[PDB]
Design an enzyme around this catalytic site. Sequence first.
Site, PDB file in Angstrom:
ATOM      1  N   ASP A 223       0.800  -1.112  -0.146  1.00  0.00           N
ATOM      2  CA  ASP A 223      -0.077   0.074   0.100  1.00  0.00           C
ATOM      3  C   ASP A 223       0.633   1.084  -0.037  1.00  0.00           C
ATOM      4  O   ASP A 223       1.991   1.033   0.124  1.00  0.00           O
ATOM      5  CB  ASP A 223      -0.730   0.054   1.143  1.00  0.00           C
TER       6      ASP A 223
HETATM    7  O1  LIG Z   1      -4.209   5.872  -3.825  1.00  0.00           O
HETATM    8  C1  LIG Z   1      -3.187   4.720  -3.723  1.00  0.00           C
HETATM    9  C2  LIG Z   1      -3.280   3.632  -2.749  1.00  0.00           C
HETATM   10  O2  LIG Z   1      -3.156   4.399  -1.597  1.00  0.00           O
HETATM   11  C3  LIG Z   1      -3.620   3.736  -0.390  1.00  0.00           C
HETATM   12  O3  LIG Z   1      -4.084   5.020   0.222  1.00  0.00           O
HETATM   13  C4  LIG Z   1      -5.038   3.103  -0.521  1.00  0.00           C
HETATM   14  O4  LIG Z   1      -4.769   2.322   0.938  1.00  0.00           O
HETATM   15  C5  LIG Z   1      -4.984   2.076  -1.505  1.00  0.00           C
HETATM   16  O5  LIG Z   1      -6.225   1.488  -1.670  1.00  0.00           O
HETATM   17  C6  LIG Z   1      -4.889   3.005  -2.746  1.00  0.00           C
HETATM   18  O6  LIG Z   1      -4.542   2.172  -3.799  1.00  0.00           O
END
Ligand SMILES: OC[C@H]1O[C@@H](O)[C@H](O)[C@@H](O)[C@@H]1O
Lengths: 825, 829
Positions: A223
Site C-alpha cells: 500500500d
Molecule cells: O491511492 C493509492 C493507494 O493508496 C492507499 O491510500 C490505499 O490504501 C490504496 O487502496 C490505494 O490504492
Amino acid sequence: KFDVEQLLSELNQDEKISLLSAVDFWHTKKIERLGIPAVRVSDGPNGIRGTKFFDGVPSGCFPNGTGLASTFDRDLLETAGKLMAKESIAKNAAVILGPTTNMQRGPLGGRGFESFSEDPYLAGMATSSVVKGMQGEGIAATVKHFVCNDLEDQRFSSNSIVSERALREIYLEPFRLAVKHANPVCIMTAYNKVNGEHCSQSKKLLIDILRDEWKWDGMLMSDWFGTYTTAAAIKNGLDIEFPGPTRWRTRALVSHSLNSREQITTEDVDDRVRQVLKMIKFVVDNLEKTGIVENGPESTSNNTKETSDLLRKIAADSIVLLKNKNNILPLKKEDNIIVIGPNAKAKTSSGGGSASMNSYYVVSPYEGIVNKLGKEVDYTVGAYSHKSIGGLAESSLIDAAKPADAENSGLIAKFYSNPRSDDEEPFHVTKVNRSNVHLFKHEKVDPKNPYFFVTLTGQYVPQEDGDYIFSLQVYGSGLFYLNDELIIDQKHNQERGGAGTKERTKKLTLKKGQVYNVRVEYGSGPAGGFQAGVIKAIDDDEEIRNAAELAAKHDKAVLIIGLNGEWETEGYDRENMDLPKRTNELVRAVLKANPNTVIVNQSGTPVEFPWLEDANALVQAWYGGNELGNAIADVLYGDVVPNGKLSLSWPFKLQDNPAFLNFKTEFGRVIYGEDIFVGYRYYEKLQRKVAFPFGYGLSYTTFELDISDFKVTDDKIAISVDVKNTGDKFAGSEVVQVYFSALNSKVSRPVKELKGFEKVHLEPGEKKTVNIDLELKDAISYFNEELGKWHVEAGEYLVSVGTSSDDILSVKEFKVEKELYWKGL
Amino acid sequence: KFDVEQLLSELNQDEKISLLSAVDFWHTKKIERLGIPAVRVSDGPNGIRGTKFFDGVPSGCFPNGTGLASTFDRDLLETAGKLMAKESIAKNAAVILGPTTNMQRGPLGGRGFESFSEDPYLAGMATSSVVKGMQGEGIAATVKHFVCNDLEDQRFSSNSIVSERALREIYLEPFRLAVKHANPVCIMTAYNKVNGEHCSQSKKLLIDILRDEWKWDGMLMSDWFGTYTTAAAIKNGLDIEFPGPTRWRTRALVSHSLNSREQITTEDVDDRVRQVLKMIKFVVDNLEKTGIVENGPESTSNNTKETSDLLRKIAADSIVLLKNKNNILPLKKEDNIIVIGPNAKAKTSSGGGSASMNSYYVVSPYEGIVNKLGKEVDYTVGAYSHKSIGGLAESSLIDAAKPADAENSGLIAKFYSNPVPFHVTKVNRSNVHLFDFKHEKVDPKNPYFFVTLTGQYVPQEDGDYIFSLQVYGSGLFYLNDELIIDQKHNQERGSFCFGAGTKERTKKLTLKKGQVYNVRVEYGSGPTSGAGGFQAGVIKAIDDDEEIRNAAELAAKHDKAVLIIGLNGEWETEGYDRENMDLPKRTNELVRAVLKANPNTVIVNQSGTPVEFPWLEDANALVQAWYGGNELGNAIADVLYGDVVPNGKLSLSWPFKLQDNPAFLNFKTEFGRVIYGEDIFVGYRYYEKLQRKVAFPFGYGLSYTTFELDISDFKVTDDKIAISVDVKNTGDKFAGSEVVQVYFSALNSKVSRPVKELKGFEKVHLEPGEKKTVNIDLELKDAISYFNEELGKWHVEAGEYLVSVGTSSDDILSVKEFKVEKELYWKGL
Ligand SMILES: OC[C@H]1O[C@@H](O)[C@H](O)[C@@H](O)[C@@H]1O
Ligand SMILES: OC[C@H]1O[C@@H](O)[C@H](O)[C@@H](O)[C@@H]1O
C-alpha cells in the site's frame, strides 16, 4: 519476448535495487538498456482515476463494491471488470489497483463501501469475477488489501489480532478464492499488522502462505507508504515499495545492508526482483492486445454509449428492493409525484478516497426521474445532510455577463511561487470544476518541500434572495474574500479537523441576480489541498414542514436520503450508524403526510432506519457510479425489475453487531472477538433479528424453486435447482443461494455457510434448471486450528437452497464418510 | 546554564530527530532557536587532522598508540592528553575521535598500531590517562571502537564470536577502566558484530552493559557509516549517526516508524536525544575555558617549540631498546658512522587511515642524526621497501621556469563536473585523499566530479624511472601528452583506498638528467565509472642487487652502520590487515649483507606491530621506534646518542614466527565470522601458558644503566593491596628510568587462568646509585578477579595468590603471597 531469468542475469545490482521501488506515485522503473519499460498503475476498484486527482481526466465510475457484490452475478461482474480494463487502457494504466476485498466485520468501516461482502464466498467469487474480466483484456489486477485491513482507524499501526481459524475462514478466504480461480497478477499488502507484524513484512503471509502454500506467483506491492523497514520487508516478501521516490530502499540503504551482512542477502533481492520482472512480462506480453503506450497520454476515449449503457445495467442490477407493500412500486409514468430529500439532487457516485475519481458526468436521482418522465418534476430538498459545504466551483462563473458555457463555467486557479510585485506570473493556470481541490506536479514546485500559493477567482450569482453560507477548509493556510472583502480567515487561528482544519463559515445576506466576486488566496500545504464552498441557507423546521405539506398534495412522494463519500471514506470510520442531521425527522414528517412514499437510500453500508415500520417502500441504491440516477429511475418505474440481494447483514441498531465493542484501534490493537462469527454467521448463531438479512431482496414478480436433482460422490456435490417465475406480469431475475450445514460435527460451526449461487432470468411463467457442482472440500471444510489444516469431517450435512439466508425453500440431507485433511488451494 | 531537561522539553519532534544524526562528516546539528551550536569533532587518537584530508591544515602528529603505551608512563600520557586537547583547540574541534583501544589478539591487525596494548590493564590505563588529559583541558574524548573491532577484514560485516569471559576480561576491560577512572564524554561503536549482533545496535553492549551496569552517562556515536537499521539502532541505544547527511535517520524514516508503531516509541528517541544533549552540554560548559568557535577556522597556531619539545619527548620515551651487546650504543659523536636503509630518509610518522594527518614537518631519522652531529652524514638507501610508489607531487614544480619555492613546489589540481573548474588547489602530497572533500558544487550523496592533475618533473639522475598510477574511480597518466599508465580499462582490485581502489599499475621509462617532462593525470572520481581518491607517483629505479653490495661495502669502511628499517602506513593501515609478519622486499637480505660486513651495526625498526627478524641472532644492537610523529627523527637521535636514556617497554608480545601467535588460524573474516578461539589467552597470556618462547616478551626493554628492586613493604586489607618497591640505578655512568610491573597469579583456582596478569605499574627516574621507593595501591577485586561466565558475575575466589614484581613479563625479581579468606561476586565498576 521479455525474458525474466535472462534479465535477472543481466541487471546490475543498482538496477536490481531500482526495480524494488516505484519511481513516482504511479510508475515503476524504466531500464532502457535492457528494454524494461515503466509500468503505470492506477486506482481503483470502481473505475479508473488515472495519474491525477486535481484536474484529473474524467472517467467511468462504477457502483461501489458492496453494491457490485449485491448483484450476485459473476457474468456481470466479469463484464464489469472487462469494462474496467477498457477504462484503464483509455488512461494507459497497464495495472489496476483493485478489486478491494477486506471484510465488513462491522458496519462502520470507513472503506466498507469499497469491498464486496461480509461473506467470504461472495467476496471471493466477486473478486474472482472482476479480476478474470480485467485480465482477459490483458490488464493486470491488484487484489487488496492483504490482509485484515478491516477498519480505517490508525491503519498504519493497527494490529488486527485474530485467531488462525477466523484468519483462514473469513479474511484470507476471498484472497484464496481469487488466487485459485483468477490468478491475479498482483496483490497489495495492507497497512496494518496481523498478530503483531506489519503485513508488508510478514513472512507468514507473504511467503509461507502466498508462495509456499498457495504457489501464487504474482507480484506484491505495498500500500502507499505502507513499508516500515529496509531489510525485513525485502527478506520477508514485499516485492516493490510504492510510491516513489523510495524511502526504505534507496541504493545506499539496500546495498549497505548487503555489504554489512545485516538481515538480507543478494538472494533476497533477486527473489523480489524476479517477481517484479514477472509482472512486467505480463504487461509487455499484452502490449499488442492492450495498446498501452509507456508514459502515454490519458483520455476520455472510453466515454461512449456502449460504456454508459453498461454502467447503467450494473448500477440497476446492484439495487436491492427492501420493501414494497400495497404495490407502491413500480411507479406509473402518469403518477403525480414530488421528489424530496438531500440525496435527490446530489451526485453520490462513490465513497471517498482513493476509490473516487473524476466522472464524465453523474446522473442525479432527480435527473434520472426527469429523464424517465420526459418533463419537469416537482421537487423540494426537505433537509440538508452534507458533512461540509462545497458546491462553489460547481455553481460559479469566470465572467457572469458571459453565458454558462463549459469554457466559462467554474473558477480559475492561478499558481504562484510567492503570496509580490504586480509583475509576477502564474506558473500554472487551471480551470477548476469541483470545489474540493486536492493536491500535483510542477517544475517550479519542489517535489517534497512543496511551497506554492493559489489565487482562486470567479463570479458567483445567487439564484434566490436571502441568506447564503460560504465556507473554507484548508490543509495549510488561506483566506476567503467576497467582493474583495475578507469573509473567512483560515490563516490566523487554526484548529485540526484528518490532517487539515475544521470548516469555518460565514453567513451572508445576498440578492438574486447580483454578481459577487469570489477570490480565495491559498497557501501551499507546508503536499496540501482546500475547499471553498457555498450553500443557500434554509430554515430547517420550515423546510421539513414544507416537504410534509407538499407530500400531502401529491399521490406519491419519492424521498432520496443516505450518506455520501464524505461520511464513508478511506481515512476514518463512521462514529455511528445514524442517518445524518435532520434526515430522520424529514422522513417521519413525509411518512405522516403521505404513507405511500417510496424511500430510496444511498449508502455503502448499513444505516439505522428508526421509522422503518412506517416506510412502505424502501430501496437500497448504494453508490451507483456515473449512471446512478438513471439506474434508480429504471428500478422505480420497472424498466429494470429489482434483482439485487444484500451483500451485507442490516442489523436494527449499531449495538447488535458483532464488532460493536472492538471496532476501534485501542493501544494500537483490534481484537477480533467474534472469531469466525461475522455477519449472518453471527446473527444466525445468536438468533438475533436484523432489519434485513444477508442475501435478501424483493422483486416485482414471485418465484419458486426446488432441488430437482442431487448427487454426492466421495469427492463431489452436484445439485440441480429448478426455478420458476410464478407471476404473469414481469420478467425478472432470481438469485439461487446454496448454503451448507454440519449436522453432527465435533467442532463449533456457523448455522450455515454460502458456498454457491446462480442468478437466473425468467419470463413470466418460465422455468429453468441451474446446475451447481462443487468439490466437497470447497463446500464443507472448516479450518482446524490445532492441526494447522482444513478438514473435511465425516458426518451428516444439510444443503439448504433459498432466496436469502433466511428464505430457505428446499433442502437435502447427505452423508460424508470420506474424511480429508488439506492445505493450499 | 545549558539545561538538558529544559531543552529536551522544548525541542519539537523534527528537532529531536535532527539531533540523532550529524550534518556532514564532522559536525552535529545547530538548533539556533535554542542556542545549541554545531559541535565539531575530529580524528584521531594520535593527533588532530581537522575537517579535511586533502588540502588539510597541518597538525601535530603524536607517536602511534603501541609506541605511546610502551612509555608505561601515566603522567606522561596524561600530558599528551593535554597536548592533544591544545591541538584540538587550534583546529576548533571540541571532540576528539580517540583514544583507540581495540586489542592486538594477533599481530597482523591493520590498526594494530593505533591501539595501545594486547594487555587489558595497560590499555585501560593508557586510555584513562590520555582521556584525563584531554578532558581536564575541556576537550571531549571518544574512546573507540566499542567493541571487538580487532581486525580490519570485512569489518562492516565481520562477526566477532567470543565468549563472555574473553569479552569481559580482554576486550571490554580497557573501556571499563576508562569509564571507571576517566569517564570519557563519548564512545564510538565499532563497525563489526559481536556474537551475531552489530555493535551499533546491540542492546547488550550499548544499554545493558554501558548504561545499566557501568552507569556511564556519555554519548554514543556510530563509526562512520556504521549504522545498519533505522529503528533498532534508536531503540538499542545508538545516540548519534555519523556522518551526515543521515542515511538511517531522515525525518521520514523515523517519524514513519514512530507513527506506524514499528519498533520505536517517542521515549526511545528522547533517550537518544538526551545523551546527545549531554555531550553538547559538556562542550558548551567549556567554551569559555577552551574558546572554541562554532564552525571556526582551522589554524596551525600550535606549531611551536614548546609543542615540538613535548612531541620529541613523548616520542623519545616510547622507543624501546631491545638489544645492545658490546656497547655499540650509545653512539658517540666521534664515531665514524654511515646511515643506511629504506626508512632512513622516509617520513613514516604514523600508521595508515583515519589516524593520519598532514604534519607541520616530519623529522626523518636520517635528518635527526644530521641535526644531532651537524655535519653531512654518509648515506646509501640500501634497498627500497615502499608498498606503492608516491613522490611525484613531492618532487615536482608548477613551472620549470622558476625556483623550487613554496608555491612553485607542487602540482596543480583542477576539478570539473565534466571529464576531459569549481575548484583549484595546489598539491604537495602524492596521495590525493578525497573522502571528505566538500564543495558548494559537489553532491555529498553523489560526489560526481573529475580531476586534471598538472605540473612538470625534473630528474636529478640518469636511468630507468618507474612511474605509478593508483585510483579509486578512474585515471589516465600521460608523460608529455603520451599515454603511459592506464587506469580506465580493465581495472583490478588492490590495496589502494582501504582496499577498495586499484592495484598499482606502473611504467618503466628512460629519462635524461635535468630534462623537463610534462605530467598530466586525468581522474574520474568514484561515482564516475564515496568521492574517493588517487595517487600518481615516480621513483628512481635502482639496480637492486648492486644497491645491496654498495651498502655492504660502504658499511665495512665505517666504525658503525646505522640501519633504519621497518614498515609504514601503507603496510599498516585502517582498511585491511597484513598478510604476514615479513619485512618488505629485499630488506632482510640487506640486513644479512650489512651484518656480515659490519658486525658493529645498530638496527632501528619502525613498525606499529611485530615483524619477524630472521637475522635476529646476528644483530647486536636493535631498537624499536614505532611511528614517532613529527619529532620521530630527533627522538631516534636522542636515544641513539644517550641524550635520552632508552626507557620504553614493549606494549606487545613479539613472537619469533607468525605461526607462533594465538590467532594464526583465525585472523581473517570467514563466512562473515571470526572465532576468538584462544579465549582469554591473548598476548603474553597465550605465550606464558604455552611456555612458548618469544623473540621479545611483553613489558620488555633495555637501558644504558642497570637496576635492581625488591619489595620493601607488602600489606593486605579487605579491599586493598599496598605494595612498596625500592628501586636503584646500580650503574655509575647513566641516569635513567626503570618500569616496575606488578603481576598477579591465582595458585589453586577452580578455573583455568593465565600464568600471571599485569595489574599495576610505575615508572621511576634514578640517578646513578640513587634508590627510591614507589608505592602501588590497588583494590583487591580489581587485581585478582576473573569473570565467571556461568554466573554472569566477576568472582573474587578464595585461595592463595602470588604477586610478582619485575621489569618485564619475563623478568620477575621478587614475589609475595597472600591468602584470600572469603569470596566475593560482583558487577559494575
Ligand atoms: O491511492 C493509492 C493507494 O493508496 C492507499 O491510500 C490505499 O490504501 C490504496 O487502496 C490505494 O490504492
Ligand atoms: O573519521 C571518522 C572515523 O572514520 C572511520 O573510518 C574510522 O573507523 C573511525 O575510527 C574514525 O573516527
